Amino acid sequence: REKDYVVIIGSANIDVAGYSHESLNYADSNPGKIKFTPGGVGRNIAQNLALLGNKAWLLSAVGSDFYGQSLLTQTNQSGVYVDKCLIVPGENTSSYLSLLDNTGEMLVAINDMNISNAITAEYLAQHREFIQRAKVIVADCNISEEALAWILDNAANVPVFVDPVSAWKCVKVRDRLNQIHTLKPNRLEAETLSGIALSGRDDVAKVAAWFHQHGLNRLVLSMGGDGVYYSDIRGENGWSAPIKTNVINVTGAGDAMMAGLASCWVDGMPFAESVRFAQGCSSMALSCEYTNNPDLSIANVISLVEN
């Protein structure tokens, strides 16, 4: 419907990748290739939702600098309503700086995302009504614990899909699983939240049971090569095997899978078929050079799912 919209609350970075032609010399500038790229879990998801054809609003933070503005403009071009983002007066627009090499092997990476704290409970309270009238809310764990707590406490029965981002950033949700509609952790993040070791496929049953005891409505557990384990507090659980994917750039896989899950839910699709669709979406970001695959569409993922 034409007034169904999805609200995404997370971070937006500029992803600076540079590699050296030939070999690192440390004797100043080594001529190579450098790429500026839009990124950040929240912003990445917002874009993938737009590409799947939802009206997606980004609630996020960028700096008063230029390039900050450029990130917003670029995202607008991809379909994302950026109208409501904070433009923080004179702060560094967040960015992830990595130093791949001629192999494509990430060597070392810096990470400057303190502007995430600008995304405050008081900033979000200014959009209470607008947030509470979305079909679904997607939140990443880059934002503060007070911000995420504000969201979960003011969702007004809108389902909140939560992206745990990393082992360190995910602990935020441990005490509020009973407010999260769908949580999408990988193996280490599920180990970190539950305190239960995830040695293999044999261990997911007890990890999921732990999650449901603590209130989690839905679990979507990525176990890498083992595929994806999904579990509903009402009883439905299963495994869905990974899609054979020609892996080009592993970044943006989880951002596509979150988008796929929220989009299918808004669409009316049942849980398991939603997990398979989202696996397809992720498979599409994976075989793309970029963090967000510009060909991600409903028609293109549906064809991937059968083939």
Numbering used by the authors: 2 to 308
Copy out sentences from the published article reporting this entry, exactly as the authors wrote them:
To unveil the catalytic mechanism of EcPsuK for the pseudouridine substrate, we first obtained the crystal structure of apo-EcPsuK; the crystal of apo-EcPsuK was determined at 2.3Å which belonged to the space group P6322. There is one EcPsuK molecule in the asymmetric unit, which can be modeled from Arg2 to Asn308 and folded into a conformation employing the β-α unit as a basic structural motif composed of a central α/β region, and a β-stranded region protruding from the N-terminal. Furthermore, two β-strands β2 and β3 between the β1–α1, β7, and β8 between the β6–α3 extend from the central α/β structure region. These two consecutive β-strands are corporately constituting the antiparallel β-sheet in an edge-to-edge orientation (hereafter named β-thumb region). Therefore, although there is only one EcPsuK molecule in the asymmetric unit, it is a homodimer. Dimerization of EcPsuK is mainly assembled by two regions including the β-thumb region and α2 on the edge of the central β-sheet. The dimer interface adopts a face-to-face mode that looks like a butterfly with the four β-strands in the β-thumb region almost perpendicular to these elements from the adjacent asymmetric unit, which created a cross β-barrel-like fold. In detail, the β-thumb region of each monomer of the EcPsuK homodimer rigidly contacts with each other through many hydrophobic interactions, creating a hydrophobic core. Taken together, these interactions anchored the EcPsuK homodimer.
